[PDB]
Structures are given as C-alpha cells and as structure tokens.
Design a protein around this nucleic acid. Structure first.
Ligand SMILES: [Mg+2]
Ligand SMILES: [Mg+2]
Ligand SMILES: [Mg+2]
Ligand SMILES: [Mg+2]
Ligand SMILES: [Mg+2]
Ligand SMILES: [Mg+2]
Ligand SMILES: [Mg+2]
Ligand SMILES: [Mg+2]
Lengths: 261, 109, 110, 261, 109, 110
RNA sequence: CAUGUCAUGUCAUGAGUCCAUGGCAUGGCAUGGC
RNA sequence: CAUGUCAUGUCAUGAGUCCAUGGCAUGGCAUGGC
C-alpha cells in the first residue's frame, strides 16, 4: 500500500538516463557537448522540476479552494522542496540506483556531510523521464501518484504550520468592537507587540493594554495584525473585565474622557 | 441580571437593526430586477457581477419584494416600534399571544 | 440603468449589518419576563442601566427574544439561515412569499 | 495576424474575476476572508504563474533538444518574467480593463513611477482564468497561443544574449592543442583574464600570453573557461606565429626547456 | 612548403591513427556481439546503454568485423607500413596505380 | 559477460581518435609529389623538418592524401562520414562488407 | 530555477610533462529570474 | 513564487471619535521556497 506504486518508464534508454549523473559522462573528452547533454539527466531534472511544481500546484489549488495565494505558496513549499523530494527519492531507492563517478558510500567523504541535493535531482529527473517517454498518458499517472505522496505531507503541514493556520472564524472588527465597548480617548487603550515573527519562531504575540499598563488580553498568530486581533478577542471573552471598564467609562465625565490627558 | 455591558450592545444592535432594514427597503429593488440581472448577465456591469454570486443582493431583493406586497409582518412593526413604545405602558405591543407570556413567567420561576 | 455599483455595496453592507444585528439581539437579550422584572423594580438593577430601561430598544430586544423562545420567528428565522440556503444557481425566491404574486409583480413593471 | 488571437473565457463570472484587483474587494469589511479570496484574482494569478512556466518550459524544451539546463533556464527567464508578460498584457489591453480602487491614470501618482507589476499579474490571472473555466481543452489553446507569443522573444534572445550563445563548434582541447604545438615549461605559456563577467557586462575576455608578455591570442565568452578556449583558438589560427614558436622550441635544449627557469 | 608546424602534427596524427586501429581491433568484438546487444537490451548493463545510441561502438564493431574477414584493405597496409618503409626506397608501397602518380606530377606544374 | 564498461570507453575514445587522426592527415598533408620533391632536395627544405623526412609518417600521410586526391579512399571515406549516416535504429552494417559473410560469422560463434 | 567567481578535495585530460588544461563533489562569495 | 517588518502616500473602517483600527499603492529592510 505504501509507498505508492511507481509509474513505470517504458523506454529503456530513457529509464537509464534519469539515473546517469553528469560526473559519469562529463569527464569523457571524446564526447561533444551536445552528446554529453543528451547523455546525463540534467535536462530531465530541469523538465521534471517544472512538471513537479505544475501538478503539485494543481493538486493543492483544487483541494483548498478557500486558501489564499500565500497559503497555497507556503504549502507548495513543503511539497516541491529538495529536502522533501530527496526523502521520497530515498523511499524509492533512486538512491543507490544512481550512477556517479565517485563514492556515494564512505561517510568520511564530503558528499555525505552535504545536503545530498543529488538525491533530490534524481527524483525530478525520474518525473521528467516519464514526460519524454509518453507525455500524454504518463501525465495523469504523475498526478495520481503525486497526490498519494502529497497526502501525508499536506496533513502534517496544514496542522503544525502557523502560516497555514486557518484565519477564518476570526473577527476582523474585534479590535474596534473592543474599543466601542470600553475604550475612550484618555484610557490610552493600545496594543504592544511583545514578540515579532522570525524564521526561528514564526509566531507573533501582542498584548492589549490600557494606559496604566493593565493587560486586558494576549494573542498569538502568524503576524502582528492577527495576534492583535486575537488579543482583542481574548479581552472580549471576559465579561467581568469588560463590564468593569464599560462601567468605568460611564463614570468619567465626557469633558475628561475625550482628551488624551 | 442585565449587565451594563449587555445593555449598551443591545441598544446599538436594535438601532442598527432598524436602520439596516430602512436602507435595504430604500436601496434594493425587488426580485423582478434581481431576476432580470441574474438571468442574462451581459448588459449587467462587470463590477457588480461578484455580488450576484453572494447571498446579500438576493435577500435584499426578496425583502423589498415582501415590502412591495403586504406581509412585511414582523418587519414593519419593528420600524414603527420606536414611536409606539411608551414607558408606563406595560403591553408587549407585538403580534405574540398574551397567554404565552403567562407560561414563560411560570417556567422561569 | 439599474443597479448602480455604489448602491450595491451599501446594500450588501446593510443586509450584513441587519443579520449581524438580529443575531446579537438573540444572543444578548433575555425575554420579556426578565425585562418586565427589571423595569418594575429599578431599585435592584445597577444604576448605569436606568436610562437604557426607559428607552424602546431593550423592550424591543426582549420581545424579539421572546418570539425566538417561542416559534413564529417567521421571516427572522429565514433571514439568519438565508446565507446557508443560498446556491449560486437558484431561480426560486426561497422565502414565504407566494410565487403567484411574483407574477403579478412582473407585468406591473413591464 | 498580430497579436495572436486571445483564447476566450466562456464563463462570464470567471472572465470578470481575472480583472478584479484586490483593492476593489479587500476594503469591503462585510465580506468574509473566504468571500474576499473568491472575489479578487490573486488565486488565478498564482495558478496562472505555474501554468505559464509549465508550458513555456515545454515549448523551449522541445524546440531546443540540444540546449543545456542553464540555457533552457536562461531562455525561460526571458519568457516568464514580469517585465515580459507585462508588455504582452498591455498588448491585449488587459491594462485598462483592470478594476482597481485607485487611479491607474494620473502620471504624478506613485503607481506610474513603479514597476507596474500589477499589469503582469493580470496576464497570469487571465491564463489561470482559462484553466478554471475549461481545464481540458483550454490548455492546448494556451500552448498554441503562448507558442506564437514566444517566437519573437525566443528569436531575439537566442541571437543577442551571451548566455545563449552556442558553445558547439568550439574546441575543448584547443588549450592543450596549443601547448602541444608550441609550449614548453620555461616558455611560461599562460592565460590571464582581463575581464570577468558581470551583470552589466556578461562577457569574459582572456588573453593567451607567453612569458615575456607577448599576446598570442584573445577570446570572448560567457565565462573565463570559454573565453580562454577562444583565445587558444585565436592563437591556433595564426600559422606564422605558431610555426615561429614551434621552431623556437626546437632551438631550445631539452635541458633548459623542461624547467620553469 | 612543408612547414615545421605541419610536420610535428602529421607525425603525431599518423602515429595516433595506427595506435587507434590496433586498440579497436584488439578491444572491439564484431557485429554479432554488437547486434546481440542492440537487439535485446535487457541483459546489457545500464552503464553501456548510452553508448549504443552513439556511432562509435557500431563503427568499432564493423571494423573488427572487416578484420575477422579479409578486406581490411587499406587498414592492414597502414599498420604494417612502419616496418615496410625504407629511406632510399622511393616506391609508394601502397595499392595505388603508379600511372596516377605520373598525371598528378604533371597537374601540379 | 561481454562488453565491459571500461573497455567501451577506451573503444569509443579510440574510434574518435582514429577519425580525428585521419581528418587531420587529409587537411595538413600534401600529396606524394610534394613529398617526393622535399625528400629529394633536402637542401631547400627548412632544417627542422629533416629528421621528420627520414621517418615513415610523412610518407604515409602523403600517400593517404594521394588516395584522397584520387578515388579509392574506400573504407576511409565511409569511416569519416560514418557519424552522419548513423541512425539510432539501423540493423544494417552500412559498410562495404558482404551481409552474406555476416551470416557465416553468426554460426561460427554459436 | 539556473548563472558567475573563488577555496579545498578527488578523478580525469594533453603531443617537449620539473609543464599545461579540464570534470565532479563539498564549502564560501556574488549575479539573475519565478 | 510568497511571507515578515517598517516609511510615505491614499482610500476606507468603528458604537464615548481631540480616540481607535484596517485596505491599497509606492519605496526600504528582512525571511523562506524553486
Ligand atoms: Mg540540475
Ligand atoms: Mg526543484
Ligand atoms: Mg532540481
Ligand atoms: Mg499576486
Ligand atoms: Mg510569475
Ligand atoms: Mg505573479
Ligand atoms: Mg559552489
Ligand atoms: Mg513593500
């Protein structure tokens, strides 16, 4: 059942080419540049990359009709990356099948301590191989095959990634809604960002505070705007706090409350 | 019972409720116009097209349709409500049965 | 022509505010029993709500909540659930309106 | 005959969406985030981009079977760029058809002084529109249409761009061939790079010199390795020079010539 | 006439020419083996597959084939040439007609 | 097994050197007339080429150029143009070899 | 997705080689496109 | 291809508004993927 059944390449000459690394042919001096290019897999990898991104895009585009472009882009990033497809490649043992001029073994070699992008390339090259062999009918077999591979990756990503966290059910007017109920000019009701999103921590934390420093709410999200909203929603859920400040505003003369001081 | 926070929201909600219906009745045409647009969309301007794929315009049209006819029912009494209301008059003033007010009193004891 | 674009936006916003308004009424408002209690004994209720009790809104909210505790929300129930039942292609009115009067309205314009 | 006939979008709702810029809908506060995303063209542009790159890749891949990945990549760069597709978009008057919330006119506006990437986006969005409308049969109409658009761009690029300059007919052994005929250890036969390729000037110039500084040849290419080869080929074409140095080597004692000094 | 630069290339070219044929005849099998491989390519190792799409291996096989038979013709005389050559012998030593040498002499005057 | 990979490369290189060698001969070499002139009067020719004239190569190059000025390049013409006439699928020998002897070679191995 | 330019390692290339020229891998720096 | 974070301009949003909150455009800086 797993992994998904690998689409077969009918042409034997093509099936061999995807596994030929340039180190094998590029060192043969009697070959013309053209003959070299038709020998190794570099063209297939190049083509395979565009195909990969093409059908991955179509997969997620249809599966998530309400996703924005930033979410479709972020999700695709997980599917088409070299790190991801390298692991799929190892899964199919492309891996050992690859023909190089050097040692893939021997852990003391610099190769093993690198990013092994070579193992990603052979996956794209295999896809490209299918497209040269039989462009028509191997294309849908690529979709159906890459759908199956993507499913577990999509599941984990949409769950555990902040960028993909659903922003619906959120109240965009929550900040104004809060100010309406409680805030007045001299209250100095504001929002401070305690944590800005980074690569290491793609989270934002914003606190909703009043003038004296009292924190009415806290929120977390993909960015300051989203976090600030959640902070407002956090404060809006506490009725005793709101009713306190709502009453507090009523006790302030309209004379005083409209100023900032 | 009856928090201040609940009260300022209720007054704003009821107010906005009435203004909203007045604006709809005023601005919206009936279903005849809405059905004219939705049937052949060619002549209809490009900017309004996405609106026809959303519920708001149709619902607006149907409410104006209910208004062009009788059977606004609840909706009319709501707009006129502000004028009919009086402090010392304890009557409900709506179309609801006075006997149902009796049972709800007993229920909440 | 008909259906100006600027008017469409005002309409769409108005319809949205209408629905959001009614929902918040049902949510926050108690029934006429709770209202009648508060308005009758105002010595118990918090001081801040007194001017509010003297105005039409709270009573109107309590009565709409009352119709909701009962049946005969009528149009109101349809309107809140309208967003769901809307399909991109439906030529039917979906409301309690008689389709026969829809025809009599047709030639009236003509 | 020109421009190529624009593929038509049957669905009227979709045809309208490609021309709706987010400034139109995103400012409408009564709309849910989902309703917004289904309103503007951002998803169509996102999808349209991957389609564009997909069929452009397939076009050049087949048209140039002997091109390397670096050449297929460099060529594609000319076809799929925002600057290129912006001009195609203007050509079809997408342009004025676009619906924004601001003034596209009024040259004193900051918009006109920018990169007008907005005009590129609507082209991709139009492509994406065709794919949602009728994915099956509008796809080949996209190839046939983009083939026609690409033809003049491909022609100019393969001619006037150094990266795309054909490296066949070049002699990879030319440098060794030269040393064989003339060079000896004490001749100090070497190559100096006078000009390294840059963004402003993607040319490399290398001179083939002997020990005393005499320049036997000069060459130009996409990089030092290619330029150096042409410099060798330049020196190899002059027989009187070669025959002079070949004779010169014979007059040197094998005792002396094998050292570097 | 006869530049030094031309002469060092000619000696290297002729030398490499002879070595090349010897290496081919030695290493290459005949067409029977080459036709065995090219017909069913399954058993044939993956590394050699691209070679079968290039001319070199076939030409090598055919030359070894011509060698397994008679009719090496020119090719045999070329290898043996080094041994047959003598300084004071002015004969061409090849299969070409001596009368054709006469006409070429006259032509180049 | 048959056809070792390391041997294939040596072969392919050898065949390539073979063709490149013959072409450079035809290009650079004059005919037997020019050779016979130089070898006969060596007082005229440049001093550097004298040891070269005493060795087999120059004569062999001159004679191959001679066969080229004439016809009867024979195998040699076929070999240089071989690269062109090669098609990925051809089961035919393409040379002057009799295909009848191709059969007699077949069962010889068997 | 490619390109350019270096450092190291390794494998090759060439015909005067104590010389000369390249392929790959790893790691920098830089460029360009999506 | 998107993301994050700012500056300016402009258009909007909200119910105590001398307050508060957003959309877009242009221009920086930064991140991530191909
Ligand atoms: Mg590659
Ligand atoms: Mg890739
Ligand atoms: Mg790749
Ligand atoms: Mg976009
Ligand atoms: Mg793009
Ligand atoms: Mg784009
Ligand atoms: Mg590097
Ligand atoms: Mg910016």
């Amino acid at each position: 059942k797993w992994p998904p059944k690998l689409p077969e390449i009918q042409d034997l000459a093509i099936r061999a080419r995807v596994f030929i690394h340039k180190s094998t042919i590029k060192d043969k001096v009697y070959l013309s540049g053209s003959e070299m290019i038709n020998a190794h897999n570099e063209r297939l990898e190049f083509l395979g990359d565009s195909i990969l991104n093409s059908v991955m895009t179509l997969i997620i585009y249809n599966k998530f009709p309400d996703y924005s472009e930033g979410q479709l882009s972020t999700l695709r990033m997980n599917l088409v990356s070299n790190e991801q497809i390298k692991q799929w490649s190892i899964m199919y043992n492309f891996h050992e099948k690859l023909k190089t001029n050097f040692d893939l073994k021997d852990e003391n070699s610099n190769f093993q301590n690198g990013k092994l992008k070579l193992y990603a390339d052979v996956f794209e090259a295999y896809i490209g191989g299918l497209m040269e062999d039989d462009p028509r009918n191997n294309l849908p077999k690529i979709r159906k095959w890459l759908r199956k591979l993507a499913k577990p990756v999509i599941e984990e990503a949409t769950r555990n990634q902040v960028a993909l966290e659903k922003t619906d059910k959120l109240d965009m007017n929550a900040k104004r809604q809060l100010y309406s109920l409680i805030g007045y000019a001299s209250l100095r009701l504001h929002y401070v960002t305690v944590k800005k999103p980074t690569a290491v921590d793609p989270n934002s934390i914003v606190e909703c505070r009043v003038g004296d420093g009292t924190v009415l709410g806290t929120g977390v999200g993909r960015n300051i705007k989203i976090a600030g909203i959640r902070a407002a929603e956090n404060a809006l859920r506490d009725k005793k706090m709101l009713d306190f400040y709502a009453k507090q505003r009523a006790a302030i003369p309209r004379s005083e409350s409209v100023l900032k001081d | 019972n009856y928090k201040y926070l609940e009260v300022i929201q209720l007054e704003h909600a009821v107010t906005k409720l009435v203004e909203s219906y007045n604006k709809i009745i005023e601005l919206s045409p009936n279903l005849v116009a809405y059905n004219e647009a939705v049937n052949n969309q060619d002549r209809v301007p490009v900017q309004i097209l996405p609106s026809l794929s959303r519920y708001q315009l149709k619902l607006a049209a149907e409410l104006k349709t209910l208004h062009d006819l009788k059977k606004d029912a609840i909706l009319t009494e709501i707009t006129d409500y502000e004028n009919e209301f009086d402090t010392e008059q304890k009557q409900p003033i709506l179309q609801e049965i006075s006997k149902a007010d009796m049972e709800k009193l007993e229920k909440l004891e």
